[PDB]
Amino acid sequence: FHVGDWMGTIRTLTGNTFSLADCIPLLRKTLKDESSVTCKLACTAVRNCVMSLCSSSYSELGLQLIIDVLTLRNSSYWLVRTELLETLAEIDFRLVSFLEAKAENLHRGAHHYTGLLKLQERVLNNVVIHLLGDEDPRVRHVAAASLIRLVPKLFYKCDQGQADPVVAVARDQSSVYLKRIYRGYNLLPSITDVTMENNLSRVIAAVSHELITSTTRALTFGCCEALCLLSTAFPVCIWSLGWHCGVPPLCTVGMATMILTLLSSAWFPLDLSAHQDALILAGNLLAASAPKSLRVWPALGDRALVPMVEQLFSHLLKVINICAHVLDDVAPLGSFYHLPSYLRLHDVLKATHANYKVTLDLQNSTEKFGGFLRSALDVLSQILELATLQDIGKCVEEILGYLKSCFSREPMMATVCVQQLLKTLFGTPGLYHYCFMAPYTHFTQALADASLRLFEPLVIKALKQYTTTTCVQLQKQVLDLLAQLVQLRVNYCLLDSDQVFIGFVLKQFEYIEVGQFRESEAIIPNIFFFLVLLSYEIGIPKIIQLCDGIMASGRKAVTHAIPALQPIVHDLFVLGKELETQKEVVVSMLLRLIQYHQVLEMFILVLQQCHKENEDKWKRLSRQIADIILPMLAKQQMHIDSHEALGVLNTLFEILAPSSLRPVDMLLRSMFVTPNTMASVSTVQLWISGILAILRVLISQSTEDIVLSRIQELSFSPYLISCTVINRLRDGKNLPEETFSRFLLQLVGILLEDIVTKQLKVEMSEQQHTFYCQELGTLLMCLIHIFKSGMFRRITAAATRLFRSDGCGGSFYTLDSLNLRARSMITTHPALVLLWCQILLLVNHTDYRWWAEVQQTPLGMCNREIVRRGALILFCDYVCQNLHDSEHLTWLIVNHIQDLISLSHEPPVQDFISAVHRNSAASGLFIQAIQSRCENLSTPTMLKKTLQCLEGIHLSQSGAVLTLYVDRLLCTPFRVLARMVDILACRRVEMLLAANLQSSMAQLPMEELNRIQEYLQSSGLAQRHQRLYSLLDRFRLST
Amino acid sequence: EDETTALVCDNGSGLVKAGFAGDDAPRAVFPSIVGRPRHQGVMVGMGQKDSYVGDEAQSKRGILTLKYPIEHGIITNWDDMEKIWHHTFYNELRVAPEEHPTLLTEAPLNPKANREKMTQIMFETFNVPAMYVAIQAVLSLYASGRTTGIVLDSGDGVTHNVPIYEGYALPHAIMRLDLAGRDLTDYLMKILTERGYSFVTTAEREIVRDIKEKLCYVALDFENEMATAASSSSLEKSYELPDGQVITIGNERFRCPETLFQPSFIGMESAGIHETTYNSIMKCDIDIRKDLYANNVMSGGTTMYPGIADRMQKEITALAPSTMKIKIIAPPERKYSVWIGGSILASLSTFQQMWITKQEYDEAGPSIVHRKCF
């Protein structure tokens, strides 16, 4: 985003004069072009181009192209309107609200408008919800998927988290760079983001309003399609405080009373393109009451909720009653004969079934009967969980007849209707918090813990299908129907004479090893759960010979071999002499497979049982995997490529026994290693994950004293990875204080010559760039724990003689070379240039060359104000700790005045000011600065933060706060800013006269007192504020 | 956010004045009325709406019977008061009371049950972190920016009088006088009847309230102005009704506020408002009386009439020692002085520890109002 510096290098090389000021008015014009084919191609040009400007220095011109696409919302070519909304889905409307506050001429723009330029309420009420009410079935579907992409990106004003638009952009870029009941509902305490529940409750406010106050057929019809795609990405049970509107007034039943009145009308179900999306959304809103209500329909326990469930269970047995009389040509509790409202629903399921049986096309997702029969067996399932035996006991006759006819069309979710019935027939925050102080303290808290039978006709039909089908979505739901007939002890009479079904599961292991099987991935976790659970009644000797074939003789591990053992290990280690021999067999196989990070989740299960069963056996097994993995981490055979992969390996060294990690002979030879070649970002990325996860052990599991006595014996030279050694790989008396401090400051130097000087799509991926800038995020959390916690005494003093020192003739990454890389990290990665601000303070390096670029000491780029206001909250907290140095007090107050006041709701700059009130000479310099900056302290939010900082100052400087309270700030037209500077000026006069009359007269001069009262009589200010004028007349006459 | 703002509501009878603490003027000011459809409606697709609250009731007046829920500083009907506060918070201010501490004003010498039930509703109806109930007269004194004075508070609810000296307060010298704006309205519609204009119902009772809010004034001498009512010229004023009927009111106009200085006209023995001020000042200690005479503060809605300040000055100067000068300080803006006094109080930093917390209520119950606050 350095459009300043990069354009200088080209112009002296190729002498063209072509800036980007001469191309955006060439792109603003083709959006206004005549032909509707010319307008489809110019709005894909803004999909690429307005996420890069709006966070750049040209973001004055970047906001204007957001404005013009909004006029393109009502052109009559159906491909012109759907490539608009994709360039209004990829907008980050928390970064867009930040530029509005900075604008003064852009709010006016053309024709000199007055008011605010409200992009967000105009792009959300008048495009995205508005384009739901379009006539095309093509335009209504694409507008729903944007409200899945808009809700994490809104920033409505004044939440109880993010306050400013400055603090809003800083929290979406710190999560990136600093780290069986049915599917409907939840029973957890459900930890949730408080401010992400607020953006999802304003998008379900304006969406239930064009469904009730709408006057068209087309607004009611395509806004039941936009509520079914929220609840499959933002479910109701997890985000219930967003969905809540009214019902039970407190775990919610949100908005489900309107939508039942849509279905009970005789108009709305007569078209299957959006009657199938109003059934998946009425089952999500009666299931979020399940964590509350459950203690006719005796398990509901809330009589204001029973007519909502009586209706859908009456509505879903009359729609499996019209799908049973259609799949079988039969003439027309659940009964649709006598209703004339549901004889209209029998002519609509018979138009979509004459086109399937006549036109052969098997692989269609959208069929509108095959799409409609999928919708009304998914939601007959989710209600039976709320039901009991007593409510269903008159209906087990009913629902089983319909499915025998409803079996052949869609058997994949007609056993999901059968899997559930048998359960319930058998009972069953101000930019210092976000960037540093909230992620810094999840770091140090996990280190102290590191110091620690009507089914008998229907069941026989489902087994003939598994031997003869080929779609592997259907083969997965039939291996869960048989793991429930063995837990709920149905006797093994499904195969009355022979062993027909169990012989067929053995043959399928022949097709996976060779590879003559198409979709073995989605069946191999559920093939092996069925087999181990039968042996408690094929025995566990025979089960483990089948799994050994797949691994060594077959496909790769992360699909076949590693999901093969998740059923075995959980069902063998968790749940006499025969059981001892089989546990030795399973632990040997994983040692061949330690390399994968999914195999390291299975082995956290193994170490927690030995601490419970037998603590003599617990310490033998943590020594055997100590000398396997640490030879792998030096030769980089361990797949730690993911941030799912570094999370599994750090909960391992807590649970591994500390006797196996107590000699530091092994952890250091695995640490101080050089990889083979660091040319490729496959190989650069696995060497810097071996250094971050054995360094979580040398901080918790062993203190500072033990580590440095060893390196005096082991000759680990600090020229290990030096600037002569690092250069040939990319192309291809030392203290123990001195050896370990050159290794952690030149590994900050490897991660920062890449992210600046590597291309973004050429050498690395983007999934490989989520985890390359995230290994620089947890290695700067390891360096501010050593310098602050004080347990590491020797390592703090070693860096201070090095950042002050030059490199050894250029053989190291010297401290002026390392800091040029970081100021071009300002703009691409602004959350990680706040962690490099807190290291340079901590070493005694307060060098005013680098601290002026980051604070700009004498529209805007949106990604620098996180760092400019982030390095001034961190530069005060270094001043507040050691306030004895007066050289740093007089710099930050004289220069940064409009920034020092406007941060005063923050815990590190709230403490900077109280010490100034403590100090005699430091209080007098703060008041000379406001008199120069009274021209900017006139806006109504900037003046409320001065009076809380000019509230209590030193009593020796209360004579300069009373000439500022009268001359400058009292003449404001705000009548609660003229009323609150009457509380603070009458209070200076009262503490002074009970004080000494000697020191106060030299404070407020007798010649200076007569200047003040001439200002109040020619004006009306004395006669307005009576309490201020009474106190100053008694001052003179005693003196 | 810092300090959380705070909310302030004045409910004397007649008007809710409400807004944020920390501002010079309230956002919402509306009549404290609950107006119910007395006539059964016959259409389809009306309302229904059981009742209308606020200036909605003023707009749809003729259908409604209007009930003031506060009489004489006393809430007559609690559900009607809750509805009025529900209207303030949700209809006008658009706040969740959970997010704001709420200041209520309340009148002197008022039944304990109003303060205790008022707190009970604030905690157990609109869930709120904290609240305070404060005396009306002290808030007006704060708004006037003076540390000392005798505050003559007269709303539409009741008239009150609180002498204050250097802060402090004198409980024995506090006087409450049952006269109000509302009693002047009932007198006024009674004195219009001798002219032939008969206003019999609640809807046009608020029409004579509007008449009295502008046409009425106080005589600088009653008998002199009643004598010059023989030659009617300037003392008559034409008034337009919303019906399109014209009303012409002569001497009847200024003898309605005269009732404050002559409660023998209403038929009550209770002394006129200037003698009540003497009754309060006489109950005070001898020493302070000098500044109480010179620092009389008028507050409330029924001190708005033109010439009240001059009449009070002439009568108090006539009764008192002419040894000392009787200044009366009656600001314009005096109508909103209680709300402004509540704005300044909740903006005070020290006051942020004297709130009745929700926690302290949950432990120690509704009775703690009187224990902590005045």
Short mmCIF file of all heavy atoms in Angstrom, two decimals, chain A residues 301-330:
data_model
loop_
_atom_site.label_atom_id
_atom_site.label_comp_id
_atom_site.label_asym_id
_atom_site.label_seq_id
_atom_site.Cartn_x
_atom_site.Cartn_y
_atom_site.Cartn_z
N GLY A 301 -43.79 -28.11 28.58
CA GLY A 301 -43.78 -27.39 29.84
C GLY A 301 -43.96 -25.90 29.76
O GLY A 301 -43.59 -25.19 30.71
N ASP A 302 -44.50 -25.38 28.66
CA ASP A 302 -44.71 -23.95 28.47
C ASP A 302 -45.94 -23.82 27.58
O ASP A 302 -45.87 -24.07 26.38
CB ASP A 302 -43.49 -23.29 27.84
CG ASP A 302 -43.52 -21.78 27.93
OD1 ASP A 302 -44.50 -21.23 28.46
OD2 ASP A 302 -42.55 -21.15 27.47
N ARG A 303 -47.07 -23.43 28.18
CA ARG A 303 -48.34 -23.55 27.47
C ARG A 303 -48.54 -22.43 26.46
O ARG A 303 -49.49 -22.45 25.67
CB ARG A 303 -49.49 -23.59 28.47
CG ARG A 303 -49.47 -24.78 29.42
CD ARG A 303 -49.94 -26.08 28.76
NE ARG A 303 -48.91 -26.80 28.03
CZ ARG A 303 -48.01 -27.60 28.61
NH1 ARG A 303 -48.04 -27.79 29.92
NH2 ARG A 303 -47.10 -28.22 27.88
N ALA A 304 -47.66 -21.43 26.47
CA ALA A 304 -47.68 -20.44 25.39
C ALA A 304 -46.88 -20.93 24.19
O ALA A 304 -46.81 -20.25 23.16
CB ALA A 304 -47.13 -19.10 25.90
N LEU A 305 -46.25 -22.10 24.32
CA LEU A 305 -45.39 -22.63 23.26
C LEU A 305 -46.01 -23.85 22.60
O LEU A 305 -45.59 -24.24 21.51
CB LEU A 305 -44.02 -22.94 23.86
CG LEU A 305 -42.76 -23.29 23.07
CD1 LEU A 305 -42.64 -24.78 22.74
CD2 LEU A 305 -42.77 -22.48 21.81
N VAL A 306 -47.02 -24.44 23.23
CA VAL A 306 -47.62 -25.66 22.69
C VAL A 306 -48.41 -25.45 21.40
O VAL A 306 -48.30 -26.30 20.50
CB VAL A 306 -48.42 -26.38 23.79
CG1 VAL A 306 -49.07 -27.66 23.29
CG2 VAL A 306 -47.51 -26.70 24.92
N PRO A 307 -49.20 -24.37 21.20
CA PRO A 307 -49.83 -24.20 19.88
C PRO A 307 -48.87 -23.97 18.72
O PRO A 307 -49.27 -24.15 17.56
CB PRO A 307 -50.76 -22.99 20.08
CG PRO A 307 -51.09 -23.03 21.47
CD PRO A 307 -49.86 -23.46 22.18
N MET A 308 -47.61 -23.60 18.97
CA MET A 308 -46.65 -23.53 17.88
C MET A 308 -46.13 -24.91 17.51
O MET A 308 -45.69 -25.13 16.37
CB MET A 308 -45.48 -22.61 18.26
CG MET A 308 -45.73 -21.12 18.13
SD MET A 308 -46.94 -20.43 19.27
CE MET A 308 -48.33 -20.17 18.17
N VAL A 309 -46.17 -25.86 18.45
CA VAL A 309 -45.66 -27.20 18.17
C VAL A 309 -46.80 -28.14 17.79
O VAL A 309 -46.62 -29.05 16.98
CB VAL A 309 -44.86 -27.71 19.39
CG1 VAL A 309 -44.35 -29.12 19.20
CG2 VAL A 309 -43.70 -26.79 19.66
N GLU A 310 -48.01 -27.89 18.32
CA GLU A 310 -49.19 -28.60 17.85
C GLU A 310 -49.46 -28.33 16.38
O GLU A 310 -50.01 -29.19 15.68
CB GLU A 310 -50.43 -28.19 18.65
CG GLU A 310 -50.52 -28.68 20.07
CD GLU A 310 -51.76 -28.13 20.76
OE1 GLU A 310 -52.48 -27.32 20.14
OE2 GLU A 310 -52.01 -28.50 21.92
N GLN A 311 -49.10 -27.14 15.90
CA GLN A 311 -49.41 -26.80 14.52
C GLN A 311 -48.44 -27.44 13.54
O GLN A 311 -48.87 -28.05 12.56
CB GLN A 311 -49.45 -25.29 14.33
CG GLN A 311 -49.84 -24.91 12.92
CD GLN A 311 -50.18 -23.45 12.76
OE1 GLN A 311 -50.15 -22.69 13.73
NE2 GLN A 311 -50.51 -23.05 11.54
N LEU A 312 -47.12 -27.32 13.78
CA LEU A 312 -46.16 -27.91 12.85
C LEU A 312 -46.21 -29.43 12.85
O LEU A 312 -46.00 -30.04 11.80
CB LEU A 312 -44.72 -27.49 13.15
CG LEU A 312 -44.23 -26.12 12.70
CD1 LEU A 312 -42.80 -26.00 13.12
CD2 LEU A 312 -44.33 -26.01 11.21
N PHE A 313 -46.50 -30.05 13.99
CA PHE A 313 -46.61 -31.50 13.96
C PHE A 313 -47.94 -31.92 13.35
O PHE A 313 -48.09 -33.06 12.89
CB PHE A 313 -46.44 -32.07 15.36
CG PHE A 313 -46.32 -33.55 15.39
CD1 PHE A 313 -45.16 -34.16 14.95
CD2 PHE A 313 -47.35 -34.34 15.85
CE1 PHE A 313 -45.03 -35.53 14.97
CE2 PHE A 313 -47.23 -35.71 15.88
CZ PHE A 313 -46.07 -36.31 15.43
N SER A 314 -48.92 -31.01 13.31
CA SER A 314 -50.08 -31.22 12.46
C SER A 314 -49.78 -30.83 11.02
O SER A 314 -50.42 -31.31 10.09
CB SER A 314 -51.28 -30.43 12.97
OG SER A 314 -51.71 -30.90 14.23
N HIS A 315 -48.80 -29.94 10.82
CA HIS A 315 -48.49 -29.50 9.47
C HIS A 315 -47.52 -30.45 8.79
O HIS A 315 -47.40 -30.46 7.56
CB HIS A 315 -47.92 -28.09 9.47
CG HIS A 315 -47.84 -27.48 8.11
ND1 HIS A 315 -46.85 -27.80 7.21
CD2 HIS A 315 -48.62 -26.55 7.51
CE1 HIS A 315 -47.04 -27.11 6.10
NE2 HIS A 315 -48.10 -26.35 6.26
N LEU A 316 -46.77 -31.24 9.56
CA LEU A 316 -45.78 -32.10 8.93
C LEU A 316 -46.26 -33.53 8.80
O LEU A 316 -45.57 -34.35 8.18
CB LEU A 316 -44.46 -32.05 9.69
CG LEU A 316 -43.73 -30.73 9.50
CD1 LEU A 316 -42.48 -30.68 10.34
CD2 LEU A 316 -43.39 -30.55 8.04
N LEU A 317 -47.41 -33.87 9.36
CA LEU A 317 -47.98 -35.17 9.07
C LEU A 317 -49.00 -35.09 7.95
O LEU A 317 -49.45 -36.13 7.45
CB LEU A 317 -48.61 -35.78 10.31
CG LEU A 317 -47.61 -36.16 11.38
CD1 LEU A 317 -48.33 -36.73 12.56
CD2 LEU A 317 -46.60 -37.13 10.83
N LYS A 318 -49.39 -33.89 7.55
CA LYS A 318 -50.26 -33.75 6.39
C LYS A 318 -49.45 -33.47 5.13
O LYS A 318 -50.03 -33.31 4.06
CB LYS A 318 -51.29 -32.65 6.63
CG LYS A 318 -52.30 -32.94 7.72
CD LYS A 318 -53.29 -31.79 7.84
CE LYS A 318 -54.41 -32.08 8.82
NZ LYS A 318 -53.92 -32.15 10.22
N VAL A 319 -48.12 -33.39 5.24
CA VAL A 319 -47.28 -33.17 4.06
C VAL A 319 -46.42 -34.41 3.80
O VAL A 319 -45.86 -34.61 2.72
CB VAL A 319 -46.48 -31.86 4.25
CG1 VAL A 319 -45.53 -31.55 3.12
CG2 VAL A 319 -47.42 -30.71 4.35
N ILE A 320 -46.37 -35.32 4.78
CA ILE A 320 -45.94 -36.68 4.46
C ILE A 320 -47.16 -37.51 4.11
O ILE A 320 -47.05 -38.66 3.66
CB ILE A 320 -45.13 -37.25 5.64
CG1 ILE A 320 -44.04 -36.27 6.01
CG2 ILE A 320 -44.34 -38.49 5.27
CD1 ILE A 320 -43.34 -36.61 7.30
N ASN A 321 -48.36 -36.94 4.25
CA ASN A 321 -49.54 -37.66 3.79
C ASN A 321 -49.86 -37.32 2.34
O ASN A 321 -50.61 -38.06 1.70
CB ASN A 321 -50.74 -37.35 4.67
CG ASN A 321 -51.82 -38.43 4.63
OD1 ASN A 321 -52.74 -38.41 5.45
ND2 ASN A 321 -51.72 -39.37 3.70
N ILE A 322 -49.35 -36.21 1.81
CA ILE A 322 -49.56 -35.91 0.40
C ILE A 322 -48.36 -36.41 -0.42
O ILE A 322 -48.45 -36.60 -1.63
CB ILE A 322 -49.83 -34.41 0.20
CG1 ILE A 322 -51.02 -33.99 1.05
CG2 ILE A 322 -50.31 -34.08 -1.20
CD1 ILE A 322 -51.22 -32.49 1.10
N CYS A 323 -47.24 -36.68 0.25
CA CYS A 323 -46.13 -37.29 -0.47
C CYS A 323 -46.23 -38.81 -0.48
O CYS A 323 -45.48 -39.47 -1.21
CB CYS A 323 -44.80 -36.85 0.11
SG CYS A 323 -44.39 -35.13 -0.24
N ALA A 324 -47.15 -39.39 0.29
CA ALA A 324 -47.35 -40.83 0.22
C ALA A 324 -48.36 -41.20 -0.86
O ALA A 324 -48.22 -42.22 -1.53
CB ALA A 324 -47.80 -41.37 1.58
N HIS A 325 -49.39 -40.37 -1.03
CA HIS A 325 -50.38 -40.56 -2.08
C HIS A 325 -49.94 -40.05 -3.45
O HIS A 325 -50.73 -40.12 -4.39
CB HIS A 325 -51.70 -39.87 -1.72
CG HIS A 325 -52.42 -40.51 -0.58
ND1 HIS A 325 -53.02 -41.74 -0.68
CD2 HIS A 325 -52.69 -40.05 0.66
CE1 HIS A 325 -53.60 -42.04 0.47
NE2 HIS A 325 -53.42 -41.03 1.30
N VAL A 326 -48.72 -39.52 -3.58
CA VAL A 326 -48.20 -39.10 -4.88
C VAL A 326 -47.19 -40.09 -5.43
O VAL A 326 -47.26 -40.45 -6.61
CB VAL A 326 -47.62 -37.68 -4.77
CG1 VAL A 326 -46.66 -37.37 -5.90
CG2 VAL A 326 -48.73 -36.69 -4.85
N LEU A 327 -46.28 -40.58 -4.58
CA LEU A 327 -45.32 -41.59 -5.01
C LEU A 327 -46.01 -42.90 -5.35
O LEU A 327 -45.51 -43.69 -6.16
CB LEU A 327 -44.27 -41.81 -3.92
CG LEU A 327 -43.34 -40.62 -3.67
CD1 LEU A 327 -42.45 -40.89 -2.49
CD2 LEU A 327 -42.52 -40.34 -4.89
N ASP A 328 -47.16 -43.16 -4.73
CA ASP A 328 -48.04 -44.25 -5.14
C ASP A 328 -49.34 -43.65 -5.65
O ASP A 328 -49.95 -42.83 -4.96
CB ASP A 328 -48.32 -45.18 -3.96
CG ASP A 328 -47.06 -45.82 -3.43
OD1 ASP A 328 -46.08 -45.91 -4.19
OD2 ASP A 328 -47.05 -46.23 -2.25
N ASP A 329 -49.77 -44.05 -6.84
CA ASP A 329 -50.90 -43.41 -7.51
C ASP A 329 -52.21 -43.85 -6.85
O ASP A 329 -52.96 -44.69 -7.36
CB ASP A 329 -50.90 -43.72 -9.00
CG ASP A 329 -49.75 -43.06 -9.72
OD1 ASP A 329 -49.28 -42.00 -9.26
OD2 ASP A 329 -49.31 -43.61 -10.76
N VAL A 330 -52.48 -43.26 -5.69
CA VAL A 330 -53.69 -43.51 -4.92
C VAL A 330 -54.50 -42.22 -4.91
O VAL A 330 -53.94 -41.14 -4.68
CB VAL A 330 -53.36 -43.99 -3.49
CG1 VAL A 330 -54.63 -44.17 -2.68
CG2 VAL A 330 -52.58 -45.29 -3.55
#
